[model samples]
Target: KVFGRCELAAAMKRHGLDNYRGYSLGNWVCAAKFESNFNTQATNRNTDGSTDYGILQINSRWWCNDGRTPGSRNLCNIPCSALLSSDITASVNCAKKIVSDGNGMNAWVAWRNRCKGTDVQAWIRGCRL
Candidate 1:
């Protein structure tokens, strides 16, 4: 499902992205806005023969196992298809594991470029927390 801005903020907050791993809800919301445009089923193949999956666009190289990426570690230990579900619970869990593992939010370049070092409060403003 493609989530509306505030709708996604609400979902993200419910998933514990609010201040999860020291990143604000705004930060996460902004990241999701650009990563997959809040679309759960979005997937993109990269030049490295890796693919990014789901709303947060977790990479296939070291996170979710897509059964195709070379040397994929499946650090999240779940099938890449898991992230495509609209439920996003698995994406949230895997994302938590991702940020906690020291990669931080920059694991998604969308987050690093559009969200980091910027004012993101507007991303969560209408959501009312």
Candidate 2:
């Protein structure tokens, strides 16, 4: 789903990701903004020849398969296209697994480059969460 920022924030909060795994909602919001602009269908090609998918831009290398790639680890145990949905349940669940794997939002390069140590208040400025 192409969610507005506030709508995405609400969904994240509903999924118990408002400060989940010690990461704040603002962090997720910022990362999602930088990663996919809140578009669930967003896709990006990585230099390693893998593609990133969904609102969180989960990568095909370790999370899902893009069909063209060989030996995808698919740690999320889900099809990459499953993440590209208006309903964020699958994507958020996979992200939770990623956080449990000890990276938190750091699993996303966008989070590392754009959200870490930054003031991301505006990312959720008007959200009712």
Candidate 3:
């Protein structure tokens, strides 16, 4: 499937996994896919003013530093400093590393659980997307 952003595609490659429809990485990607519809230029704020930006809702005001004005650049071209690093590739890859532990898909269930809380795993299991 298409990941929307080129940086996400790079992140996927760095994590050493291919695009598969029914797996943890794919599921995690679904979260991001929903968050921004793959648009790196996307940004949003909840009613409470909790802002999330980029392809991953990274809160650009806090996580971004390299002049994120529209068409800023690819996330892979940025530096790494925190969870919401300038590089989208690094950010997603780091997340993938956390879930994969360099082993691959070990934390898939955990990621889904974290995404939806306690009942998330079952929902993810039955999810057609």
Candidate 4:
């Protein structure tokens, strides 16, 4: 599930991604709320703080990492919070690549229905500078 519902909405606003999949910010907010409860820093742990991490519960050190360092100390190049970056274009593309295993944003598939539309929001607000 995705996190930072309001913040994601804000990020979508900042990055001009409100029209994704023919959906509006209001609709996106609804979906996000249903998905991850809007918690950007949300996570699910298994008695360890490192099990599930970040907004989308991406498990940065696991699935997304290439494990090129000691004790597999690599992190996902794309953090779920990367969506908060002001560069919506790049952020969205990166997110797509990350979730789709470098193919495209597939988080919407099966569970979410996979809507890969690179539409940024019209108004931007709080995001990375």
Candidate 5:
């Protein structure tokens, strides 16, 4: 599903991404924008042969199983394909796992380079989640 800006923020907040592990809803929303532009079906392959999938772009390297990553830990214990569903619940859950893993939000370079250390409140301000 292609989510609008506030729509994505609201959906993610409903999934417990608001201030999850010390990260704000805005941070999550900002990451989502850069990761997949709120498109649930987005996917990208890495040079290491792994791939990223879904809204949060959860990857096969350490999060999900895709049978493509050389050594997928499948730490989230889910199929990478699950992340691509329009529902996006699985993608949110896996992203929670990613942050809790101590990798933090920087797990996505897009987030680190663009969303981090900035006042990202604009991403969720008017959403009022």
Candidate 6:
């Protein structure tokens, strides 16, 4: 699913992402914009054998198992393919787990590279909420 920035912000707000796991919605939205441009079905093969999944691009190495990679940690107890769905609930939940695991938004390279210290307000600029 391709969401406009405002629509994505609204969904993130409705899902209680504003201060989830001690991180602001700005961090999450900024990271998601860089990671997937709000495309729910986004996927990317990293240099390693693992892949990134969903809007947040949760990796297959630790969070979810794609079955292609054996011995996956599967910390979220979910299949990586599930993250590809338009419904972002699974991805968001797993992301919370990921951040809680201690890396915060640093788990996403996109966040570290593009979102860190940026003006995150621009991401939710036109949203009514």
Ranking by TM-score: 5, 1, 6, 2, 3, 4
Tens-place lDDT digits, model 5, residues 10-116: 89989899999999989999999999999999999888898999998888988899986875789888999999998878998889888987679988899999999
What's the lDDT of the predicted structure labeled candidate 6?
0.86
Off by over 4 Å in 3: 1-10, 15-23, 60-87, 93-129
Runs of candidate 6 with Cα error greater than 4 angstroms are none
Higher-TM-score candidate of 1 and 3:
1
Find the 10 residues in a row with the least total lDDT in model 5: 67-76
TM-score of each: 0.95, 0.93, 0.40, 0.40, 0.95, 0.94
Model 3 clash count equals 1
Q: Evaluate all candidate structures by whole-model CA lDDT and list the values in order.
A: 0.89, 0.88, 0.46, 0.42, 0.89, 0.86
Per-residue lDDT tens digits for candidate 4, residues 78-98, read 444453333344344443334
Candidate 4 structure lDDT: 0.42
TM-score of 6: 0.94
Model 3 reaches what TM-score against the true structure?
0.40
- lDDT preference between candidates 1 and 3, better one: 1
Candidate 1, 13-78: lDDT as tens digits: 898988998898899888888999999999999999999999999999988998899777998889
Model 1 stretches astray by more than 4 angstroms? none
Using lDDT as the measure, name the better of candidate 2 and candidate 6: 2
